[PDB]
Amino acid sequence: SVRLADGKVRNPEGIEVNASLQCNMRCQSCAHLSPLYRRENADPAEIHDTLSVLARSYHASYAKIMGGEPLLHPDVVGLIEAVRATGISDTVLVATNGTLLHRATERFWQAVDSLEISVYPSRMIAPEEIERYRVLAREHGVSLLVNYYGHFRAVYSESGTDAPDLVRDVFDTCKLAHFWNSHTVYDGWLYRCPQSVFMPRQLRDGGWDPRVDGLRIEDDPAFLERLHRFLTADDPLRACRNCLGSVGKLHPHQELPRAGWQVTEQLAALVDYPFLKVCKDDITADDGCVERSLSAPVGG
Numbered sequence: 420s421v422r423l424a425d426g427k428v429r430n431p432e433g434i435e436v437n438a439s440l441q442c443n444m445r446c447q448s449c450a451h452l453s454p455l456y457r458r459e460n461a462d463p464a465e466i467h468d469t470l471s472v473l474a475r476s477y478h479a480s481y482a483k484i485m486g487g488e489p490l491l492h493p494d495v496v497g498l499i500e501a502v503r504a505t506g507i508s509d510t511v512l513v514a515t516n517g518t519l520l521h522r523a524t525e526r527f528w529q530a531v532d533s534l535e536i537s538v539y540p541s542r543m544i545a546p547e548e549i550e551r552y553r554v555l556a557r558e559h560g561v562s563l564l565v566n567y568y569g570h571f572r573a574v575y576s577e578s579g580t581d582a583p584d585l586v587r588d589v590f591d592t593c594k595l596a597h598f599w600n601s602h603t604v605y606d607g608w609l610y611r612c613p614q615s616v617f618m619p620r621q622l623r624d625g626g627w628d629p630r631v632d633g634l635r636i637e638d639d640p641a642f643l644e645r646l647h648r649f650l651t652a653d654d655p656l657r658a659c660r661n662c663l664g665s666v667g668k669l670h671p672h673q674e675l676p677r678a679g680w681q682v683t684e685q686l687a688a689l690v691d692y693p694f695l696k697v698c699k700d701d702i703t704a705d706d707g708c709v710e711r712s713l714s715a716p717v718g719g
């Protein structure tokens with residue numbers, strides 16, 4: 420999907436910037452493991468500098484400001500403008516669980532190009548407030564997407580697999596690595612996915628340094644080539660051996676207590692093997708997590 424053109428790596432999807440690693444929700448199987456993270460809000464100046472370096476060799480269709488809950492950031496509009504100023508993307512998208520959206524000001528609605536709201540059963544957003552948000556979106560020329568989630572899929576385990584065939588299959592079918600292109604910027608490094616950077620240091624055994632799976636963003640004389648090779652590499656990451664990619668077992672969406680939130684079951688027992696077969700045939704196969712989706716795009 421990713422191509423090299425006019426001196427830059429072109430991602431048809433988005434570059435992901437996590438405004439906040441923490442969240443106000445405790446969803447089971449959170450892909451960013453946000454329930455395990457204390458407050459950590461990205462610095463707009465640092466993000467601007469890092470993305471400015473990356474943007475000389477990289478362009479994406481959109482920048483996705485997300486994380487745990489980006490509306491927890493003390494100055495999300497400043498972050499939005501820091502990202503926009505680099506020109507690394509065509510548009511800027513914010514993804515939120517919506518629980519704090521009633522506090523967003525006119526500044527927020529004027530700052531974003533697109534808004535993605537996840538609506539979860541335990542924090543249901545009333546349909547009249549969704550309608551309020553759709554009206555606000557149309558008024559400010561913001562493309563709106565509202566996903567009503569019924570299920571989540573398992574994402575990781577502390578007890579990883581030593582079976583290379585299974586890790587190969589999980590990597591090959593991973594939507595984050597190959598279809599969604601969830602390129603993630605964190606602390607000056609670029610990653611193929613949020614799992615490879617956010618899950619290793621949250622293993623209670625201590626894990627490992629996630630930078631082994633990353634690429635340092637720098638003014639290297641060959642940075643374009645290094646970037647292209649990193650983003651088109653076809654070998655499983657170290658983190659793959661503790662991850663379920665896109666084929667983890669389905670479960671009803673629910674929040675868990677913080678105590679005991681981490682997953683210890685052996686990774687092989689958490690694979691949805693029929694779905695792994697299906698995704699081996701078609702990596703775009705719907706994961707069955709979104710029950711329904713509302714889209715109100717801006718067009719013309």
Ligand SMILES: C[S@@+](CC[C@H](N)C(=O)[O-])C[C@H]1O[C@@H](n2cnc3c(N)ncnc32)[C@H](O)[C@@H]1O
Binds near residue numbers: 442537
């Ligand atoms: C880290 S979240 C974006 C941030 C924001 N706090 C939110 O979710 O509303 C990334 C997206 O992937 C979805 N997601 C996270 N974990 C998932 C899982 N284990 N299975 C399926 N979808 C998941 C979430 O619904 C979310 O829309």
Ligand code: SF4
Binds near residue numbers: 449453486516
């Ligand atoms: S909302 Fe649920 S999924 Fe999205 S970040 Fe917070 S916890 Fe993880």
Ligand code: SF4
Binds near residue numbers: 595611613615660664
């Ligand atoms: S770690 Fe390996 S499997 Fe898990 S998401 Fe990143 S690439 Fe896909």
Ligand SMILES: [Cl-]
Binds near residue numbers: 450
């Ligand atoms: Cl996700």
Ligand SMILES: [Cl-]
Binds near residue numbers: 578580660661
């Ligand atoms: Cl392990």
Ligand SMILES: [Cl-]
Binds near residue numbers: 645
């Ligand atoms: Cl390298």
Ligand SMILES: [Cl-]
Binds near residue numbers: 681682683684
């Ligand atoms: Cl467990």
